[PDB]
C-alpha cells in the first residue's frame, strides 16, 4: 500500500510517497537525493519520537488510512551540524485570515 508524506525540516517540506512496507532508511535515501545529506547525517521523527532505520513506515504508524494524498502524514527531519544533531524544528505554515462575516 502507498503512504503519502510531508518530510519537514525548518521551512522545507518534501511531498513524497512510499510503500507501507518500505523502511525509515529508504525514506532517508529519498531525502539524500533531494537535500544532498547522507542518511547517517539525518534523523527522522514521528511527532517527537526518533524512528529506527530498520522499521517499516507501517510499523512507524504511517498507514494508508492516515497518510492520504489529500492529507499526508508528517515526518520530522533533523540534520547533523558539525559534532551534534540539531533540535527537531518545524516551522508552521502561515495563519489564515479571519473568516469574513459572509462566510460565518
Amino acid at each position: 500500500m502507498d503512504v503519502f508524506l510531508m518530510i519537514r525540516r525548518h521551512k522545507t517540506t518534501i511531498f513524497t510517497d512510499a510503500k507501507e512496507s518500505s523502511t525509515v532508511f529508504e525514506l532517508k535515501r529519498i531525502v539524500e537525493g533531494i537535500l544532498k545529506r547522507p542518511p547517517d547525517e539525518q534523523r527522522l521523527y514521528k511527532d517527537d519520537q526518533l524512528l529506527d532505520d530498520g522499521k517499516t513506515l507501517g510499523e512507524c504508524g504511517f498507514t494508508s488510512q492516515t497518510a492520504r494524498p489529500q492529507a499526508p502524514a508528517t515526518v520530522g527531519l533533523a540534520f547533523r551540524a558539525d559534532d551534534t544533531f540539531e533540535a527537531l524544528c518545524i516551522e508552521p505554515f502561515s495563519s489564515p485570515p479571519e473568516l469574513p462575516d459572509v462566510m460565518k
Binding site: F4, I14, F15, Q70, L99
Partner: protein, 89 residues
C-alpha cells in the same frame, strides 16, 4: 526521480515531484534545467494545500476505485480559489 521547488510568499520551500507540479498548466508552461518557482502572492497555508491537490490529482485521475472528497477548510477557501485560478489546475 526529478523534483521542483515551489516557494511560498512567506519563504516556505515545497519540494514536489516534477510530474506532479506539471498538473498546473501554469507551472508546465514555465518548466516543460529550471526547477525553482517563487510565488510572492501565495502564502504557505495555501501553497501547501495546492501541493496536496497535485498528489491527490495524480493518484486519483482515471481511477476505478472510490475517490475521496478533496477537503478545503473554510478559512483557506478564498485564497486557495485565487491560487487555483492562477495555477490553472
Amino acid at each position: 526521480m526529478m523534483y521542483v521547488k515551489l516557494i511560498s510568499s512567506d519563504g516556505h520551500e515545497f519540494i514536489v515531484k516534477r510530474e506532479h507540479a506539471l498538473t498546473s498548466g501554469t507551472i508546465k508552461a514555465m518548466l516543460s534545467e529550471t526547477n525553482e518557482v517563487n510565488f510572492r502572492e501565495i502564502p504557505s497555508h495555501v501553497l501547501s494545500k495546492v501541493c496536496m491537490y497535485f498528489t491527490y490529482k495524480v493518484r486519483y485521475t482515471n481511477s476505478s476505485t472510490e475517490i475521496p472528497e478533496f477537503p478545503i477548510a473554510p478559512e483557506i477557501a478564498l485564497e486557495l480559489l485565487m491560487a487555483a485560478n492562477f495555477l490553472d489546475c
